[PDB]
Amino acid sequence: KCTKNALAQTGFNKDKYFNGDVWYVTDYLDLEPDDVPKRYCAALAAGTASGKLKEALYHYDPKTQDTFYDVSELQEESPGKYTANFKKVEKNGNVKVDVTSGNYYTFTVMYADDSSALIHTCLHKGNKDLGDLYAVLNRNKDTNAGDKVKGAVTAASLKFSDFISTKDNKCEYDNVSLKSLLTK
Ligand code: HEM
Ligand SMILES: [C-]#N
C-alpha cells in the first residue's frame, strides 16, 4: 500500500523543474524494501517535448552492472502531482515493454529549488501497489542535502537519518541518453 496524502509544493515552479535537465537521487527512503539487499543508483530528466511533459528514468546496479531506462508522458493531476504511464526502452528509445494500463507511477514534488528537490513516488506495476518511495534529488550528483531539503523532509514528518545515501554506491550515469530519451 502507498500514501496519497503527500503534499505538493505551494508555489511549485514547473518551468524550473521541467527544464530537460537531469536530477540525481542522492538519498532515498523505501517504506517497503525488498527482502534481497541491493545497491541503488537512479537519475531522471524531466522536461517537455512536442507539447507534453516527459520524464526519462534511469536505474543502475553498481554490483551487477545492470541498467534500465523508462520514458513516460506525464499528466498533471494538480501542480506538483503527476501520473506517469511508463514504457521500458533501450538507451536508444527501442521499446522493451510497451505502455500498459496497470503500469504507472505517481509522484509528488514536495519541495524544489534550482538545485534540489524532495519527491514522493508511488510505483504501481500491474494493479499492484509496489510501495512508498521518498527521494532527495540534486542537480549535482556530489552534493550533500542542504538545510532546505532537510527542513522539507522534517516538514513531511520523516527523519533524514532514516534516508540512505547513494553517494557511496560507486554509481555511473548516462545523462546523454537520459536527455535524448525525452523526445522518445
Ligand atoms: C527517482 C525516483 C524513482 C522513480 C520515479 C522510480 C520508478 C520506477 C519505475 C518506473 C520502475 C519500473 C521499471 C520498469 O520495469 O519498466 C522502477 C523499478 C525499480 N526501482 Fe525505481 N524509481 C525511482 C527510484 C528508485 C530508487 C532510488 C531505488 C532504490 C530503492 C529504486 C529501486 C527500484 C527497483 C529495485 C526496481 C525494479 C522493480 C521491478 O522491476 O518491479 N527506484 N522504478
Ligand atoms: C522504484 N521504485
UniProtKB/Swiss-Prot annotation:
One of its GO terms (biological process) is vasodilation. SUPFAM superfamilies: Lipocalins. This is Nitrophorin-1. Salivary gland (at protein level). The lineage of its organism: Eukaryota, Metazoa, Ecdysozoa, Arthropoda, Hexapoda. Keywords: Disulfide bond, Heme, Iron, Metal-binding, Secreted, Signal, Vasoactive, Vasodilator. InterPro entries: Calycin, Nitrophorin, Nitrophorin_domain. Disulfide bonds join C2-C122, C41-C171. Heme binds at H59. Heme-based protein that deliver nitric oxide gas (NO) to the victim while feeding, resulting in vasodilation and inhibition of platelet aggregation. Reversibly binds nitric oxide (NO). Also binds tightly to histamine, which is released by the host to induce wound healing. It comes from Rhodnius prolixus. Its main location: secreted. Belongs to the calycin superfamily. Nitrophorin family. It is found in: Secreted. GO terms for cellular component: extracellular region. GO terms for molecular function: histamine binding; metal ion binding; nitric oxide binding. It holds the Pfam family Nitrophorin.
